[PDB]
Amino acid sequence: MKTIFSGIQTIGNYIGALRQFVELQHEYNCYFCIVDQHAITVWQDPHELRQNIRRLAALYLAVGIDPTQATLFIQSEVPAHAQAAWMLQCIVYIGELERMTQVSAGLLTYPPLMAADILLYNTDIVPVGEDQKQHIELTRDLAERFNKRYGELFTIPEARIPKVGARIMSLVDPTKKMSKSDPNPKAYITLLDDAKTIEKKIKSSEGTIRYGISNLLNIYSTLSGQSIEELERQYEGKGYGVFKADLAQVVIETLRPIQERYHHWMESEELDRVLDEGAEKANRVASEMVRKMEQAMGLGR
Amino acid sequence: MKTIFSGIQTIGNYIGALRQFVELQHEYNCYFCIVDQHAITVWQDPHELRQNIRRLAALYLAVGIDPTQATLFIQSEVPAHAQAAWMLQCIVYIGELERMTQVSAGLLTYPPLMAADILLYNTDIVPVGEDQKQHIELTRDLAERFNKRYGELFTIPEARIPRIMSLVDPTKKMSKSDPNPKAYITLLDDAKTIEKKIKSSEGTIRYGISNLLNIYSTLSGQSIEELERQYEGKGYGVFKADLAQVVIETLRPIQERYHHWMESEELDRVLDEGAEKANRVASEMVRKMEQAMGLGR
Ligand SMILES: Nc1ncnc2c1ncn2[C@@H]1O[C@H](COP(=O)(O)O)[C@@H](O)[C@H]1O
Ligand SMILES: Nc1ncnc2c1ncn2[C@@H]1O[C@H](COP(=O)(O)O)[C@@H](O)[C@H]1O
Ligand SMILES: N[C@@H](Cc1c[nH]c2ccccc12)C(=O)O
Ligand SMILES: N[C@@H](Cc1c[nH]c2ccccc12)C(=O)O
């Protein structure tokens, strides 16, 4: 089976990145890494960090990520990551690092950690956007550079969101992508948003439902299963008011089961057990790579 | 006891640092790390590397380093090293790094790794020279910045070592890295090489001749005042012949033990026990670090 690696630091994420994973995970060997070591490249409150790792894990599970199916782990719990990362920072060039479009040295040297994340698992696909295209080009060069010197250890990874989905825009600025990092909470809808916020958020000159309206349609159709033409027919003479009233219900219906599970997980001692399994599985596959890598460089014995 | 940490990548060395430790290990908690991870910041042949790691260990044991006493281990075998290094590579500044007095990024980022090497063990002293003084001030700075943000978790380390020149250039310092193999005497140099190297205008033994006295004076236990006396009214030929014998006598039992360690499988066992011990101390420091930063659970 092919290998997929996703490193994770809104309904736009569910719909673009996170949704097709609940089933893709059945046809692929999937890894969902919570990159907490990448997160400290910037200022964190230890309490929020620790607590943000938890919710994320519980959310991926609440969404349908199956731990029997996929490997969901926390990056720092697999030391092979920081190990392979060091070896790769020894083969990478500063020039390469500074040329990175995107001060603590972590802001500069994190690219080799992201490459280690990927290369450790002999991954084939990396479900990332164009914003990470440069990071992938680089981990692909690093793999090639190492495979040529020491002989082939790595699969050269490819940048793909297999079965990718509609791009979700902001509710305040439909020319802007939906981002949880938005200063206006009204711009996005969070997977944990309560029925009432969703409604209010959805509620806030031409008047025709035909493909901001184009964003509400993309949201409506992916979430309801209907085609944009179905809905264009459905609302042929209808106003934005009832369309929105309808759309707010399909969003609440989607997030309800999700939110109900997120809470069971957050309360379950099974959450900690699922992450323990995932790091064991990962440490195993990763630990093996690290020693094949050292074997090749002449490290230790 | 106070903790001493030494990271290792001639007789100049032995006289300088390594020899005293044989006594010190009993009074201090000493760690002798073979920095194989630092070694890869520059081009290595995988075979020679793997090989040099082995002999360095055998040489240290052969010199008198007591494993029941100190901790001799290979850096790569303690993962906590690269983990702490990353955490410290996020608090260090690039500017800090770039002013580093000393291309592959390993050549710019290894300082945070060298500070972790030290900080992981709550080391009090680091027995290094002046060339590392910029390196130590930086690790004292990183520890400081960390404690003040998170709380008191590292002992601020001191750089103190509780000078032999080249034999071909007495204004230059002895260094294996000399293009000229006669500039130095290796610990493994045979008796013939030792003699030759030592044989190679005032003609008076008073303090390149001041260097020989210093080599002699300390491998012998005698003193310079007492050696000047001894060698009143003789010249360099005898002085040089007696001195080649104190050097052969010194290195001979070291070479015997070294060879025994090199084919003994107690070697791999001393190293296993060594990494095990390090992993224990370091691992705990690491989870204490992630605790302060909020990493994992
Ligand atoms: N508003 C959005 N619309 C579509 N895809 C998104 C949106 N927000 C995040 N993603 C995707 O979800 C994943 C999370 O990465 P990030 O871009 O940081 O959000 C990536 O693959 C993004 O491409
Ligand atoms: N030729 C030498 N003369 C005196 N001390 C030396 C000599 N070589 C090494 N040392 C000491 O032993 C160590 C090895 O030097 P280095 O490992 O390059 O920093 C240092 O701590 C020096 O202070
Ligand atoms: N760097 C990515 C997250 C990430 C870390 N490691 C990865 C490995 C593969 C894909 C993505 C990642 C981001 O900014 O969100
Ligand atoms: N960087 C040192 C060796 C070293 C690595 N880590 C260390 C920690 C403490 C003291 C020295 C070291 C050298 O150039 O030789």
UniProtKB/Swiss-Prot annotation, chain A:
Q: Which Gene3D superfamilies match?
A: HUPs, Tyrosyl-Transfer RNA Synthetase
This entry's Enzyme Commission designation comes to 6.1.1.2
Species this protein is from: Geobacillus stearothermophilus
According to its UniProt record, where is this protein mainly located?
cytoplasm
Concerning Pfam families, the annotation shows: tRNA-synt_1b
Question: Can you state the subunit structure given in the record?
Answer: Homodimer.
Q: Name one GO biological process term.
A: tryptophanyl-tRNA aminoacylation
Q: Is the keyword Ligase in the record?
A: yes
> Where can this protein be found?
Cytoplasm
Broad class of enzyme this protein falls into: ligase
UniProt keyword terms in alphabetical order: Aminoacyl-tRNA synthetase, ATP-binding, Cytoplasm, Ligase, Nucleotide-binding, Protein biosynthesis
Q: How is its activity regulated?
A: Inhibited by indolmycin, a competitive inhibitor for tryptophan.
Give the molecular function GO annotations.
ATP binding; tryptophan-tRNA ligase activity
From the Swiss-Prot or TrEMBL record, give the protein name: Tryptophan--tRNA ligase
Q: Which InterPro entries match?
A: aa-tRNA-synth_I_CS, aa-tRNA-synth_Ic, Rossmann-like_a/b/a_fold, Trp-tRNA-ligase, Trp-tRNA-ligase_bac-type, Trp-tRNA_synthetase
Is the keyword Protein biosynthesis assigned to this protein? yes
| Record's function text | Catalyzes the attachment of tryptophan to tRNA(Trp).
Family assignment from sequence similarity: Belongs to the class-I aminoacyl-tRNA synthetase family.
Catalytic reaction list = tRNA(Trp) + L-tryptophan + ATP = L-tryptophyl-tRNA(Trp) + AMP + diphosphate + H(+)
